């Protein structure tokens, strides 16, 4: 302890190759080893559906379905954050799976970039 | 500035509604609003054939390049890692617009959850 507070930057406490839990200044790997675990099963899961569906229009809906159950947890606000998209980058590669993709353009992407900026930029900042 | 520097919360400065940039310890809105910018447009757009081919044994590939792609731009190494990352839920999201989906399963997902954790893991942590 040292009770005069000042500011840190991403390192030193934690870079990676770590547990998690509040290491680092936006990096936790404790967020990611509770991906294997039943928790993010059992949500991911639940919205392989939704995004299958919307696309991109399920992102802000889905990713709030999960951030408000890491969140329930008691976990940190900013940790909660990546653990969250990281099960929210679970559903939307499984799906992948079964989804028999066909032709995908190299066009529009600048305009599906600003809807994921709709999803996740409320949590980011 | 102030001699000393002891590692303190990622509030204060940015706490929330921020425009970004170095706003919190791991949230910025910068490397967001950043996307809709020819950028990601160019780097994203290379991504979508690669993730639509693999489904998630392409995002420890694909994440790579987006990632010292942003690094390389001068942006900061936790930062880095938000913008990369935005950049790839990009890629992924754009190919269900061409990906005629059928029928996926809410089982396995489980173990996509353990493959998620080695692309990112090794990034936030």
């Known amino acids: 302890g040292s009770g005069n507070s000042v500011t840190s930057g991403g390192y030193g406490?934690?870079?990676?190759?770590?547990?998690?839990?509040g290491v680092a200044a936006g990096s936790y790997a404790g967020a990611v080893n509770r991906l294997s675990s039943a928790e993010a099963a059992s949500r991911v899961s639940s919205?392989?559906?939704?995004?299958?569906?919307?696309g991109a229009?399920?992102?802000?809906?889905?990713?709030?379905?999960?951030?408000?159950?890491?969140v329930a947890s008691g976990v940190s606000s900013n940790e909660?954050?990546?653990?969250?998209?990281?099960?929210?980058?679970?559903?939307?590669?499984?799906?992948?799976?079964?989804?028999?993709?066909?032709?995908?353009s190299s066009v529009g992407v600048d305009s599906?970039?600003?809807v994921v900026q709709d999803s996740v930029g409320q949590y980011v900042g």
């Open 13 to 21: 406490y934690g870079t990676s190759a770590a547990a998690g839990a």
């Open 47 to 54: 919205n392989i559906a939704a995004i299958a569906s919307g």
């Open 57 to 70: 229009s399920a992102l802000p809906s889905v990713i709030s379905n999960i951030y408000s159950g890491v």
């Open 80 to 104: 909660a954050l990546i653990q969250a998209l990281l099960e929210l980058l679970s559903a939307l590669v499984h799906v992948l799976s079964s989804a028999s993709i066909g032709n995908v």
């Open 112 to 114: 599906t970039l600003n």
